[PDB]
Design a protein around this ligand. Structure first.
Ligand SMILES: CN[C@@H]1[C@@H](O)[C@@H](O[C@@H]2[C@@H](O)[C@H](O[C@H]3O[C@H]([C@@H](C)O)[C@@H](O)[C@H](O)[C@H]3N)[C@@H](N)C[C@H]2N)OC[C@]1(C)O
Ligand SMILES: [Zn+2]
Ligand SMILES: [Zn+2]
Lengths: 127, 25, 96, 91, 98, 81, 214, 102
RNA sequence: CUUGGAUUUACUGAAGACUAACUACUGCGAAAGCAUUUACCAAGGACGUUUUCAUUAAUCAAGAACGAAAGUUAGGGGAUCGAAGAUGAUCAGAUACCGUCGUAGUCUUAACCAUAAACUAUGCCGACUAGGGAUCGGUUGUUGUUCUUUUAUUGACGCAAUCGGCACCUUACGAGAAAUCAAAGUCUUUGGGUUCUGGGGGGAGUAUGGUCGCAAGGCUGAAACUUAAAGGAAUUGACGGAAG
């Protein structure tokens, strides 16, 4: 029945990624970011830009032959923050409002089992 | 003056005073 | 706990020390147990166990070298091999 | 009496070559000329003949070793590593 | 003067505690002293709950829950209103609010 | 309490306290006659047994040590003496 | 200028017979041109699927099964077991404060020379009449529990081949066994085999492979 | 042969080609590490003392262990005379006049 | 940095670190410190004891062990962060904060160094003085509970007593300049034993001699001269690029 792809969404406070692959993840269908939706560098994480990027990805996956996508969600991960950036939620809502069938949503943020040292120093970024 | 840097100033001063001393035994 | 069992045998039982004494006790049949240190040469160790086989005597292979085996017997010199002549108030014979 | 405070065996070099060079030599020369325990007869009679050659005056067995000590750390690690890989292969 | 009997941390019975890095500024901060929050939130924002329910293939399919634990240095916690300056008689309240 | 009987305290309390803490110290351990159900022999065993005290030629082990009082083995009976 | 999606041969994914449904999904790759076969190609590609989909029951919604292809029959690509894992949300839901987390891992080889690493997981359980605020097991008790975990997984996993192993994982009988033979140590809950690694594979045998997609 | 040694085996006096009787890792304290195997191609990958990585035939031989005499260079020579005695049995390459002094 | 495809996706692999989540007004240790599994090594507090010796004890100039981080020497490693340095911004200027690199260093082995707001800014040993509820370890008596088996010599949990701990709550006996303190109480109603330290602020932990260190530095340690306050706790007000 429904043909499933993998819509892997990388949301960060600098840019948001909406990028669909096959079930193995080996083959790329589309990859659209908010930097292709806004001219200004500050606006790449804006939820509007992510929603537009997600609709573009929807159109591409439709003209490819993809009907449904499994959502893969992640933040920056590693030593960075664990909460996904602003664009992820808007992109997810857009994908569920384009006639695309939604599979299983998951968060795969890279979580260290205690790791290397974050940048900044022990006093941290001082603003 | 943040006494920490007051001590650091004396350390550098006392380091140099020990250079001038060794110049003439 | 062999080092404990052999320590008691030295304290209370009967024994002889050294390669030449052991061989004599194997010839006369008075040896009850032959113990060989780990760093004893194989030619001597194989010679001892051939004597042990002829006289129906068991052999115990001690983990440490002659420095350790001498210390375990409470001595200040190296012991490459020893034979127990009478266990005393110890069950080293049955425990090995 | 304690004849020298710190130079030790490198007192033969007098005041020459620099203190760091003499102190580095002292560490290896003490090991070079030391008596070691034989793993074959159990006596402290192992001495260096030449670099990498260690003889026992008692049982007359020569073992290849380090330049200045009988065994080096890398060789010790190899024995364990070769020991380990041996049983993991024969099983 | 001495503001708090616990010295602003929780370390009566030991010498030293490993630090953690602040969520915002990556400041090293003792774990017993770091202001820590355990947040459970829904992986999909509420206004899209019914839209995702419509668009989902499955029926009676649960929504995954986001779990994280947040660590803040005191400066980055006060500047985010996570805690706020209290009065002298109200500082001595460990019971959570309601 | 301002007025109290230090000389004649409540024996329930005096039994509630710690061995050294009473008016006069007194051990709260005892000696017990251990008798397995198999035989009729009598052996005296301290209630707090650090060693596994065995019986006579009947070849039985009576108690096994613990952090406090040693419990009797399966099938042994004791009487406070 | 050329449309890459017009050179795509859409094969299909087939699961082993050990699972309820083997109609996993689709895939696509450049066709078998003279300088690029589609046979070598597809081989190796790894698919991560939910065990709920493979067993048609949301009781399996959190375990994700890893399946990687090891032979292609025309447009059908046959996979074999490649590993197990929980999802992050479930594992983050289980790890709760005021209780004792306990883990265990072991390297184990199957009957047919598949070397695996198996991770167990369990938690201490608050008693129905418990009033104390926390449920903490003493350290030696946790050593005992971990020892039993390791021994039971070793004996229950090395004595069955890989296909029998993956048949054995779905009902979670190793997990309930860890549950049963620890209740004289300390009560436990949420016992699972949360992750299985396929470390080394033996020499590949189609006669054994075909026996799994009969 | 290097094909019979598992990953991480320390080996010395290693052949480059099968049957040349040893070319690699021959000086005191040096050795060759076996990195991995390529059984289908009959090739073994090794790590040379300099740090270089090399593919050799799995039929090439090597000797298990580390070449003895390691640690010579840790002790300073201290003297021109020790260098004189060193090269007295090697070749005539010492002392060295500097090109700028000519 | 990127059409030489950067970023993003999947698989395999190579490195060094680190030990998340569990993780707390909880544990251990003389302190510094100590957090993946397992095994071995020796060590330890508490508890239990109708076991043993019999004053063997307390505190301690001199003299010794250990001692975060940074730093030093030589090997080995050098992923990540990153003093210095290079560089982009902001800026009146910023050789600062912020951004990008990045040398030492960060790690380890063998040796040095001996200092921290090394803090509980509270010496150690001993005795006594007021109420309460928790928690960790040991031991002692005990169930409408869960688990083995439904039943024992199960395990967990629940209910009362104690010894030791890490602490906490109320009051103000009593203390204090107050902040506050169950000790900082039992101190003009002044005396249980004992070690160390201070004598207005600076100059100054400086100079000098000695001594330890490879060095960086550590320990010991003045005087001239200068000066009317410096300082502690709290009150009222004013102010804040602090909150409501
Ligand atoms: C080049 N490094 C300098 C170091 O030389 C030193 O500078 C002193 C400075 O402190 C002295 O300054 C001194 O004298 C002045 C003056 C008004 O009498 C007074 O403020 C006071 O006595 C004292 N600060 C100055 N007189 C000489 C410099 N070399 O201290 C400052 C410094 C930056 O470390
Ligand atoms: Zn010898
Ligand atoms: Zn912060």
């Amino acid at each position: 029945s429904q043909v499933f792809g993998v819509a892997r969404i990388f949301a960060s406070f600098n840019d948001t990624f909406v990028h669909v692959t096959d079930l193995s993840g080996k083959e790329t269908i589309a990859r659209v970011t908010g930097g292709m939706k806004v001219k200004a560098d500050r606006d790449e994480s804006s939820p509007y830009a992510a929603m537009l990027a997600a609709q573009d990805v929807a159109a591409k996956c439709k003209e490819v032959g993809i009907t449904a996508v499994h959502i893969k969600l992640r933040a920056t991960g590693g030593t960075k923050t664990k909460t996904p950036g602003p664009g992820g939620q808007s992109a997810l809502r857009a994908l569920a409002r384009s006639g695309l069938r939604i599979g299983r949503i998951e968060d795969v943020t890279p979580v260290p089992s205690x790791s290397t040292r974050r940048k900044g120093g022990r006093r941290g970024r001082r603003l | 003056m943040r006494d920490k840097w007051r001590k650091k100033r004396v350390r550098r001063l006392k380091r140099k005073r020990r250079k001038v001393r060794a110049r003439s035994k | 706990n062999i080092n404990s069992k052999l320590a008691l045998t030295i304290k209370s039982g009967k024994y002889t020390l050294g390669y030449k004494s052991v061989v004599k006790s194997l010839r006369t049949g008075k040896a009850k147990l032959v113990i060989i240190a780990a760093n004893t040469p194989v030619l001597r160790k194989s010679e001892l166990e051939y004597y042990a086989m002829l006289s129906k005597t068991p052999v115990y292979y001690f983990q440490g070298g002659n420095n350790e085996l001498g210390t375990v017997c409470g001595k200040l010199f190296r012991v490459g091999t020893l034979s127990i002549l009478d266990a005393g108030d110890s069950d080293i014979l049955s425990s090995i | 009496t304690k004849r020298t405070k710190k130079v030790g065996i490198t007192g033969k070099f007098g005041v020459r070559y620099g203190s760091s060079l003499r102190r580095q030599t002292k560490k290896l020369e003490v090991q070079q000329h030391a008596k070691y325990d034989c793993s074959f007869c159990g006596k402290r009679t192992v001495q260096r003949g030449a670099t990498g050659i260690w003889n026992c005056k008692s049982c007359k067995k020569t073992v290849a070793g380090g330049a200045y000590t009988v065994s080096t750390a890398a060789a010790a690690t190899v024995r364990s590593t070769i020991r380990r890989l041996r049983e993991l292969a024969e099983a | 003067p001495k503001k708090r009997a616990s010295n602003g941390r929780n370390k009566k019975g030991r010498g030293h505690v490993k630090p953690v890095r602040c969520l915002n500024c990556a400041r090293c901060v003792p774990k017993d002293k770091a202001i820590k929050r355990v947040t459970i939130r829904n992986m999909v924002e509420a206004a899209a709950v019914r839209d995702l329910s419509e668009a989902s293939v499955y029926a009676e399919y649960a929504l995954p829950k986001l779990y994280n634990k947040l660590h803040y240095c005191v400066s980055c916690a006060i500047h985010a209103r996570i805690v706020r300056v209290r009065s002298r008689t109200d500082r001595k309240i460990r019971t959570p609010p309601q | 309490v301002l007025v109290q009987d230090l000389l004649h305290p409540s024996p329930a309390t005096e039994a509630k306290q710690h061995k050294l803490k009473t008016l006069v110290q007194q051990p709260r351990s005892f000696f017990m006659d251990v008798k397995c159900q198999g035989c009729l022999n009598i052996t005296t065993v301290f209630s707090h047994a650090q060693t596994a005290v065995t019986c006579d030629s009947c070849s039985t082990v009576l108690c096994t040590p613990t952090g406090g009082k040693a419990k009797l083995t399966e099938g042994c009976s004791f009487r406070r003496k | 200028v050329v449309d890459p999606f017009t050179r795509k041969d859409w094969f299909d994914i087939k699961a082993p017979t050990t699972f309820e449904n083997r109609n996993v999904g689709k895939t696509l790759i450049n066709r078998s041109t003279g300088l690029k076969n589609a046979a070598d190609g597809l081989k190796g590609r790894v698919f991560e699927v939910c065990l709920a989909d493979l067993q048609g029951s949301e009781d399996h919604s959190y375990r994700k099964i890893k399946l990687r292809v090891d032979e292609v029959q025309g447009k059908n690509l046959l996979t074999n077991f490649h590993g197990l894992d929980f999802t992050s949300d479930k594992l983050r839901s289980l790890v709760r404060k005021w209780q004792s987390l306990v883990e265990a891992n072991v390297t184990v080889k199957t009957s047919d020379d598949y070397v695996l690493r198996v991770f167990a997981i369990a938690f201490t359980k608050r008693q129905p009449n418990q009033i104390k605020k926390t449920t903490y097991a003493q350290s030696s008790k946790l050593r005992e529990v971990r020892k039993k975990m390791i021994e039971i997984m070793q004996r229950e996993v090395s004595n069955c081949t890989l296909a029998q192993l993956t048949s054995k994982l779905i009902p979670e009988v190793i997990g309930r066994e860890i549950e049963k033979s620890t209740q004289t140590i300390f009560p436990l809950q949420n016992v699972h085999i949360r992750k299985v690694k396929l470390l080394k594979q033996p020499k590949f045998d189609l006669g054994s492979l075909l026996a799994l997609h009969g | 042969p290097l094909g019979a040694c598992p990953e991480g085996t320390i080996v010395s006096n290693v052949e480059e080609k099968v049957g040349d009787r040893g070319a690699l890792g021959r000086t005191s304290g040096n050795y060759v590490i076996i990195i991995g195997h390529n059984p289908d191609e009959n090739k073994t990958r090794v790590k040379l003392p300099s740090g270089a990585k090399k593919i050799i035939s799995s039929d090439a031989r090597g000797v298990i262990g580390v070449v003895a005499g390691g640690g010579r260079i840790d002790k300073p020579l201290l003297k021109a005379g020790r260098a004189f005695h060193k090269y007295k049995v090697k070749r005539n390459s010492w002392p060295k006049t500097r090109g700028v002094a000519m």
